[PDB]
């Protein structure tokens, strides 16, 4: 019932696999894991 | 409002509201006592201290 | 006016209920129950106000 | 009738009933049209969601009959623990009499050993009546959804709905 | 010299805002704790009647006061031209 990456998991997982492999490919030129939003959850 | 009779000295008009006070004394052990008191027009945080 | 209270020996009270221990332990037993609790309130069952 | 907000149960602790239910806004998303390639996922994810809110209303409690009863016996809300645990007395019933006021002053008995013990229930007297006790809330009335607002004029409408209400007499 | 008093102990906060979390034990792990947004605190409806009483006021002065709501933003870009909205309180 959560979209928008509130419940969703990590980054790398759901995500689009096509530019993850670029997320540290490209080192210090593009350094970016602010960019997309980063959920971390715990247990109920 | 309280439009009263007028006075010569200062008088704290002490208004009090009935509101049930109970204290449920949960003693499931010899020597323990576990309470929680609670009031129904009052809620437990909201008041003058 | 030159007075004072003092205080010089303290002392605790309690006059227990001289009971056949057989009954005791077991209504004392019987009010450990989850259920079987006391409840105590007031004649003034009021809150106040300043 | 196309776009209402699944309705959620206000509560007064104390009676045990819920007030009545109520429409979420302080979380609610942008109702702002995105476009033609985001307004089905808008209205297609909260789709989801309203059979996830209608399925768990007929499996968490059984379906609706009285919307709101104070007069209410228990059989889903749960009676408390029903388990007594008794044990015995160091000293005897009928092996006392022989001393005290004879002479001998008195104070598994290591006198003259016996076994006697007697178990009695510990449960609620009578069953649970009116309201919910402890914590048995959202099993009792789950946010539930009626997706088309007040479709029904004279015969009946959200009734028990409203926070100012009692099961007595409307309005 | 013979003076007799006692201390006036309190203390001094100015640059800090105070923290509560949400969890069964209250501690700040992650965004999401452990009461939070659980399951019985996400779908049922409450009130908030909290008091704040509090020191000396001198001059009228506003409480400010915050509540730890979220407001997260995806920004969409599958065509050349159109940002996509949507926003969440």
């Not at chain 3, 009954?23 to 106000?49: K, P, V, W």
């Not at chain 5, 906060?13 to 009461?35: E, V």
């Amino acid at each position: 019932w959560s979209y928008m990456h509130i419940s969703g998991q990590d980054a790398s997982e759901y995500l689009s696999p096509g530019l993850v492999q670029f997320a540290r490919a490209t080192e210090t030129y593009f350094s970016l894991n602010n960019k997309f939003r980063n959920p971390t959850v715990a247990p109920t | 409002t309280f439009e009263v009779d007028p006075m010569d000295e200062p008088t704290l008009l002490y208004v009090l509201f009935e509101v049930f006070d109970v204290v449920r004394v949960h003693r499931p052990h010899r020597g323990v006592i576990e309470t929680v008191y609670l009031r129904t027009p009052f809620s437990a945080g909201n008041a003058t201290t | 006016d030159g007075a004072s209270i003092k205080f010089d020996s303290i002392c605790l009270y309690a006059t227990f209920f001289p009971m056949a221990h057989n009954t005791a332990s077991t209504l004392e037993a019987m009010l450990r129950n989850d259920t079987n609790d006391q409840s105590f309130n007031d004649y003034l069952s009021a809150a106040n106000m300043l | 009738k196309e776009i209402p907000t699944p309705y959620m149960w206000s509560y007064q602790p104390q009676m045990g009933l819920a007030a009545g239910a109520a429409q979420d806004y302080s979380t609610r998303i942008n109702y702002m049209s995105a476009g033609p390639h985001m307004i089905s996922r808008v209205n297609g994810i909260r789709a989801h969601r309203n059979r996830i809110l209608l399925e768990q209303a007929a499996i968490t409690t059984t379906p609706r009959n009285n919307l709101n009863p104070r007069s209410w016996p228990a059989a889903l809300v749960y009676q408390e623990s029903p388990a007594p645990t008794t044990v015995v007395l160091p000293r005897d019933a009928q092996a006392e009499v022989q001393m005290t006021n004879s002479g001998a002053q008195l104070a598994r008995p290591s006198f003259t050993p016996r076994q006697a013990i007697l178990t009695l229930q510990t449960s609620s007297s009578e069953p649970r009546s009116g309201g919910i006790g402890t914590l048995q809330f959202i099993e009792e009335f789950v946010p539930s959804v009626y997706f088309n607002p007040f479709s029904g004029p004279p015969g009946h409408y959200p009734d028990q709905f409203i926070p100012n209400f009692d099961a007595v007499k409307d309005s | 010299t013979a003076v007799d008093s006692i201390t006036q102990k309190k203390f001094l906060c100015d640059r800090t805002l105070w923290r509560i979390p949400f969890s069964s034990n209250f501690m700040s792990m992650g965004a999401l704790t452990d009461l939070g947004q659980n399951l019985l605190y996400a779908n049922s409806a409450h009130a908030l009647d909290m008091t704040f009483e509090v020191d000396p006021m001198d001059e009228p002065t506003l409480l400010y006061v915050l509540f730890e709501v979220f407001d997260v933003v995806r920004v969409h870009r599958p065509h050349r031209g159109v940002i996509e909205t949507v926003y969440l309180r």
